[PDB]
């Protein structure tokens, strides 16, 4: 009888659903009077209305539902949130069921209580209108649409017992990111991850039109659905007695087949794709708001969206609806004397653990087990002597990952997008493989590497890998992420939301627990340009993560392998962090065995005594370096100008932590006056290589000592298919450039160094010669060591 | 007889396409030798092999048969190509159609001209990899994935009699902007509008896995287009023997489906939205090559994706494979003695602008004709005294479109992401209406503004809007698109996309007209924080814009409303820029009349003489201000200093056009020195307030005479939910924090000014402590005029 709906039952859940829609109204409206003991007046109403109430009568109408299966069927559930300017109907539901009084104590259950929980939405000093990381039982903000439903899938990867109910909104459903994630359920493997529910808010408007989903003929939706994997079920309808009827049927009824496929998988009976069920919510927008305002359509209209009324602080006539529609959910049979909800909505709360707002997986950093992390010595590279051998950069880190796998089979995963195999990172094939529970072929077998518990995420969308890494993350997991750094720019929204949230949980949410950094390893760069990637490729994504402060990200440029290993393995201990790697994958010359590098990427900048030739003495010169690539041309540099100039006295020192060069005023993580002018002097010149817009460096280490002398040479400009030699002429990064630029900037060289200058100059005009004759660059350039 | 394919005439099309898919080879690999007269030696092969050939077979498949309907029923196709690593298939064809040696004479239809052709792909002096703008007849490179859709039917808009054959990779296909791009044929009309033919290449691999298209069940992937709402047709199988008569049969029967479509449509038999047809093409990857390297299958696999052998250069043998591979095709049949291609292929070639690369749609700029602009000075406001009066900012702007879509009936298009309305420019819908081909109901007749011949796009996709509008400028049209600042992150990788087409066809390919810019108004600033939009939201894209120089990317910041009337005005005659305009829509001050906003604008950048002080003396500081927000604080901050400071002399500088802060040595555009140092001094302090990052006019004016003056206040971070003077506060750009900062910087004010520097303290601990008890401002702060 799980599906019948009792008489008796109905009404407490109808009584829950009116309880929730009148703190909805309450949040947006009021400030004062909670329940309205005295008549409304206009001091009660807030000032500059924000809150939304289009969205809320469906939001809360599934949640009161949801509860029902919890109560139930002792179901382990979370609620994503869509639609995140619904956040009123989160937090009402929150309240009721007494999760939030036990996470916000001033906010009650008593009177007193709700004139707090009311004065504080969408208020100076109080909370946000979206669904923030200061809202009990969230991992996820509506304010940028389209990445509620990557999300959801990424919270029920690995949570075998975890069914994720993502209200999707209408119009978000008409974003990019939405459209292709429904296509996630051919990546969740029914035997060892949870569920996703998803349910379609098809309320028919956004904010003034209406949305294309809605309009289009109920056999497109349906079809359409089918096509995306599931199998839909829709509860169309306008009058609530008989729609609870419907959605509990519904929900039971999907329920039961989200358990049948599951006991299915884990018994070994029906290895293939299921169809998982999904709802579509046909309901009016404003469901139980004003029916008309100034003769217009509010209820089931885009009028609703926002405010039905926000001109009711001015003119009584809108104050007297404000007050009628308040007393519409009859609040003195919903809250007794002292404030609290009656005895009737009590019963049927659920208990503990089971709230969907107190789920320990919504605050997934209290379930964060940290990785057990081999020692990645054992993958290091072999340098006897630096910068004269030659290694695959990325490949130890492939090997160092797959151990990582192997010792944490059900806590970490890699994502890519369809990249690990040019990434060079084909070594994690050896334990594990890609997850793909599409159909297979023969043909697989040979180098496909598929299976359907792989531990690499493969699909081609950034939106959806970079969507359910973030859930796996907030979710107590941990994952590292590789892509190219062509294609950042598309999931530049996406990192300023999870940097937004976690630099918010750090700070303001106390008792919001850290979960595992979200690791981007941007494994091939612009200046070793291969056959992917468009042409005119940049460092952008550079530049727009370090808008954000040190304090909520990192940007490290190793510049070899054994860098590299160290790098990965200090990132996968940090917390609360967006660390971006950058490290090219072709083959490099090494410089740092596995003890050099650790010393190297704990001090995050110092100087290679290896190439430095100042020892017991002022330079004449300081070359600095960031970036593999960036680094090979300025030791080339170095060489050129000690067989010229033998007294020339060079400090070359590499920057690996590029955040180091901030003082440690404005962040702590920074280098200190007195640590900045050991390394770069206080008034020798600093010629600094970078793989980067040179802008960035004059941003960060503009309050120095010596940045009067700091000259930059970075990425300006990509033309079509040059060489790697020739794209670092154009850029004038170059050995030879470099060369150039210091006999320029020493005083003493001004001169000497005219001749020499002379013949840098023919050295480049002969290496583009012969690179537009061949295409290719000399083998004495390609196959360049460190002499000395 | 148009659906049955002749026998003879199947073999010239099958010769067609082995002529075609040997060039693409010859492309890859060959820099010598182009018809193997002589056996191949490793000096004929290309070193550092760049092209891609798996989606190649498929690309020139769907040509030759594109090319016989051209032929038979006179058809106007374009063709857009998803996979852009496929261009050598797009110049393939190109070169025997003749249209690339009128295009490029160098490389003419001779052996001599098949050297060139083979040598100049992917090398360095040559042509790229993808369909860049050098390529005829293409207005859209596949470099990154997702946008071809979408720019499809911006191709299609007010093109009736133009069909737009757009062939879709099955890897991008998975993208977040391709997925939500199925849908805009619910914006299309066939009756004023064109058709898009999509052709999904369903090749079933993307580099090294499987595409989830291929591999999701049949019905699976019919329902999901049905749901998309076309008509699939599949075209499935391997030999093409057979499969050439089916291919000729499918795109027969789709378009006539196309034309019986838009018959019905234009003689108003029926309004309804029509199901248009798609095709699936399903053929192996690598279709015509190596069958087996290394013992693995590469036809029909991922291994075909970049090049079958990689390895040619080195061992003899896989050198005699690629010969083997050549000769398959049979050059021998297929090209003269003196190398051009035979009279059979030349006989069935299209003729003139009928070539699908010698279509003037695709060089939309020869067929650009410049808007009909109306004086703008009919929408100006009145502003009788400068500071005193205030109006909506961006409604005389919508009043201004309204006239230049009745002056323009089919040019002119306006583009918004369902905030027309929010952003204030209601006025549009006096004229027109929003497109709208989906179901109806009569609730939509009251505020909806639907109709199927609207003249404004309104869909919740960012990226599917900015795909609809760059094809539409690119095809010869003209475009206005309005957003808000906070959700302009999304469309980061479209505009650097857009930027690169514009540079490089402006500066390297002399035969491409120039186009109309792309317009872009961020109606909505994150200043003025509304109902709608995240909590921390930043002006983060103005810094992505302007790592394009000034070359191809303009930054307007209008004051107040004649100003963006001027700003508006011009970029709507400027051609191969993308002009960002930051405008706040809330009800501001308005400062310049129609006459003196014309004058600002043209300088981009001046003195107010009206809230200056320093009127034949010298300056004691020069208070300059960037942004209708921050321009309010700055002249709030100067009437502060006029009160408590009477002898203080103080310059007021208002900068619209943000580039001309550069000099004019880095761009024409930009200020002089001379200039520069006549606005700003050389010596006194200048109290830069700026709407964005302060280290952007750092950038921008390092070089300066006057640089150690320039006291930069911008955002730093929006919090959550504060009042419009409290986020100044915050960011300390407010009127208060300002006057602070002049009393600091000025030399004599520094003991005279402690106490109203006190006093300055008060008001700004006041204020933020009644934004606390209200919600909201003082009425003083909201009503603020400029006395004087
Ligand atoms: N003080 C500064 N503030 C902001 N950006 C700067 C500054 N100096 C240089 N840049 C930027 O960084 C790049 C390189 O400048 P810089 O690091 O000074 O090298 P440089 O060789 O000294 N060139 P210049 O400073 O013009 O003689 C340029 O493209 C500038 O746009
Ligand atoms: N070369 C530069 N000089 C000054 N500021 C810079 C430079 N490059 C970037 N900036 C940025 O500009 C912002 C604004 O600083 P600024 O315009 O100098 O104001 P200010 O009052 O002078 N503060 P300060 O320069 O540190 O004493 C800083 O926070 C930096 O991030
Ligand atoms: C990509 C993007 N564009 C625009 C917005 C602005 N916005 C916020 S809420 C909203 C309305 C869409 O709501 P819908 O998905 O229809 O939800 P429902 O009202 O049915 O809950 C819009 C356009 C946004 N958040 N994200
Ligand atoms: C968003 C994005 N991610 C990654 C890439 C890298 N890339 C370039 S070509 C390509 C293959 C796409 O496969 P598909 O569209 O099936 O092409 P085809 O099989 O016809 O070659 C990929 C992934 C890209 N261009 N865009
Ligand atoms: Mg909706
Ligand atoms: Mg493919």
Redesign the interface.
């Given at each position: 009888d799980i599906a019948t709906l009792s008489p008796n039952e109905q009404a407490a859940i109808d009584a829950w659903w009116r309880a929730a829609n009148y703190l909805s109204v309450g949040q947006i409206y009021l400030?004062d009077n909670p329940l309205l003991q005295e008549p409304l007046r206009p001091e009660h109403i807030?000032?500059?209305?924000?809150?939304?109430w289009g969205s809320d009568p469906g939001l809360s109408f599934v949640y009161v539902h949801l509860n029902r299966l919890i109560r139930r069927l002792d179901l382990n559930l979370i609620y994503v949130t869509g639609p995140?300017?619904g956040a009123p109907a989160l937090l009402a539901n929150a309240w009721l069921e007494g999760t939030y009084s036990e996470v916000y104590p001033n906010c009650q259950q008593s009177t007193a209580g709700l004139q707090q929980f009311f004065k504080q939405f969408?208020?100076?000093?109080?909370?946000?209108?979206?669904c923030?990381p200061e809202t009990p039982g969230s991992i996820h903000?509506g304010?940028?649409?389209?990445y509620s439903l990557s999300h959801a899938f990424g919270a029920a990867l690995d949570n075998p017992d975890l069914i994720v109910a993502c209200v999707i909104g209408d119009?978000?459903a008409?974003?990019?990111?939405?459209?292709?994630s429904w296509?996630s359920n051919?990546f969740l493997n029914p035997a060892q991850d949870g569920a996703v529910l998803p349910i379609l808010h098809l309320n028919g408007y956004?904010?003034?039109?209406?949305?294309?989903l809605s309009?289009?003929?109920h056999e497109?939706?349906?079809?359409?659905?089918?096509?995306?994997?599931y199998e839909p079920f829709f509860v169309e309808g306008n009058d609530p007695a008989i729609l609870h009827g419907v959605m509990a049927s519904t929900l039971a009824t999907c329920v039961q087949k989200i358990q049948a496929i599951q006991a299915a998988a884990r018994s070994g009976e029906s290895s293939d794709r299921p169809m998982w069920p999904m709802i579509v919510l046909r309901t009016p927008k404003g469901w139980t708001g004003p029916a008309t305002i100034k003769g217009?359509?509010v209820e089931?209209?885009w009028?609703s969206h926002?405010?039905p009324m926000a001109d009711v602080l001015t003119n009584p006539e809108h104050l007297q609806l404000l007050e009628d529609w308040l007393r519409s959910y009859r609040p003195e049979e919903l809250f007794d004397a002292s404030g609290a909800p009656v005895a009737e909505l009590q019963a049927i709360a659920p208990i503990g653990d089971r709230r969907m707002s107190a789920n320990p997986v919504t605050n997934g950093g209290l379930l964060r087990r940290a990785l057990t992390l081999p020692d990645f010595r054992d993958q290091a590279v072999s340098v006897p002597a630096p910068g004269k051998s030659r290694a695959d950069s990325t490949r130890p880190l492939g090997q160092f990952l797959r151990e990582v796998i192997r010792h944490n089979p059900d806590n970490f995963r890699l994502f890519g997008p369809?990249?690990?195999?040019?990434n060079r990172l084909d070594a994690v094939y050896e334990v594990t493989s890609?997850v793909?529970l599409?159909?297979?072929?023969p043909?697989?077998e040979?180098?496909?590497h598929?299976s359907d518990r792989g531990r690499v995420m493969?699909?081609?969308?950034?939106?959806?890998l970079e969507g359910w890494l973030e859930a796996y993350l907030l979710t107590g997991r941990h994952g590292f992420f590789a892509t190219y750094e062509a294609?950042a720019?598309?999931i530049?929204?996406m990192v300023?939301?999870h940097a937004?949230w976690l630099?918010?949980s750090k700070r303001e949410v106390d008792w919001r627990a850290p979960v595992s950094s979200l690791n981007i390893l941007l494994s091939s760069t612009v200046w070793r340009q291969?056959?992917?990637?468009?042409?005119?490729q940049?460092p952008?994504f550079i530049?727009?993560v370090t808008?954000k402060s040190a304090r909520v990200t990192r940007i490290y440029l190793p510049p070899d392998a054994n860098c590299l290993l160290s790098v990965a393995d200090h990132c996968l201990r940090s917390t609360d962090y967006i660390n971006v790697i950058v490290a090219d994958k072709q083959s490099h010359l090494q410089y740092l065995d596995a003890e050099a590098a650790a010393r190297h990427c704990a001090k995050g900048i110092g100087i290679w005594d290896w190439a430095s030739n100042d020892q017991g003495a002022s330079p004449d010169v300081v070359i600095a370096s960031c970036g593999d690539v960036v680094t090979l041309e300025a030791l080339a540099a170095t060489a050129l100008l000690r067989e010229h100039f033998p007294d020339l006295k060079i400090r070359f020192v590499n920057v690996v932590d590029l955040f180091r060069l901030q003082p440690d005023t404005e962040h702590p993580h920074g280098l200190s006056d007195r640590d900045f002018d050991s390394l770069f002097t206080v008034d020798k010149p600093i010629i600094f290589n970078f793989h980067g817009?040179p802008?960035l460096i004059?941003?960060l280490a503009?309050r120095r000592h010596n940045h009067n002398n700091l000259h930059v040479r970075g990425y300006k400009e990509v033309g079509?298919?040059?060489?790697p030699l020739?794209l670092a002429i154009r850029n004038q990064v170059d050995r030879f450039n470099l060369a150039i630029d210091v006999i320029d900037r020493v005083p003493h060289l001004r001169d000497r160094g005219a001749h020499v200058k002379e013949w840098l100059k023919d050295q480049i005009h002969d290496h583009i010669q012969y690179?537009?004759q061949?295409?290719?660059d000399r083998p004495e350039i390609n196959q360049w060591q460190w002499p000395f």
């Open positions: 400030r807030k000032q500059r209305l924000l809150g939304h995140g300017h969408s208020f100076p000093g109080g909370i946000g209108s979206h923030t903000e304010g940028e649409l389209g119009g978000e008409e974003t990019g990111p939405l459209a292709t296509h051919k956004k904010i003034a039109n209406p949305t294309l309009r289009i003929s497109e939706l349906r079809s359409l659905f089918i096509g995306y994997g217009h359509v089931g209209s009028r926002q405010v369809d990249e690990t195999a040019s890609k793909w599409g159909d297979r072929i043909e697989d040979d180098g496909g598929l493969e699909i081609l969308s950034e939106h959806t294609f720019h598309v530049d929204s300023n939301q937004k630099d918010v291969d056959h992917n990637g468009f042409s005119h940049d952008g530049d727009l808008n817009y802008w004059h941003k503009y079509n298919i040059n060489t020739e690179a537009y061949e295409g290719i």
